[PDB]
Design a protein around this motif. Structure first.
Motif: not given
Length: 116
Positions: A70-98
């Motif tokens: 949702x509202x991906x345009x607000x976050x999409x541009x800040x994330x760049x391959x090769x760069x480092x980030x802190x992420x706060x608020x993520x849900x640890x979620x299972x998909x299959x056994x992953x």
């Protein structure tokens, strides 16, 4: 709305490695540090919600998938391959056994290390 905290409060949260993540972990109890290695195109579901994926590598060189919803345009541009980030608020979620980290608009913060 959620009280994610000041930038200081956010950086004060314990940094966790992928190996330390567990489904159900309190979303405001940690921060995740990662280097972006892949960023997908944006996609859209039948409910008109846009989303995209990234693959991130932690300090121990392990990798995990993350999804952003949702509202991906607000976050999409800040994330760049090769760069480092802190992420706060993520849900640890299972998909299959992953595990993935899922980020839904309204619940999360991205702090680029290049701002530090």
């Amino acid at each position: 709305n959620f009280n994610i905290g000041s930038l200081s409060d956010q950086l004060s949260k314990q940094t966790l490695l992928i190996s330390q993540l567990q489904v159900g972990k309190n979303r405001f109890s940690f921060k995740f540090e990662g280097r972006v290695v892949y960023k997908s195109s944006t996609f859209q579901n039948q409910q008109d919600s846009k989303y995209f994926f990234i693959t991130a590598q932690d300090a121990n060189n392990q990798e995990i998938n993350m999804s952003f919803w949702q509202k991906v345009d607000q976050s999409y541009q800040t994330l760049k391959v090769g760069q480092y980030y802190y992420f706060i608020g993520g849900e640890v979620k299972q998909f299959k056994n992953n595990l993935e980290l899922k980020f839904k608009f309204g619940d999360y913060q991205i702090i680029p290390k290049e701002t530090l």
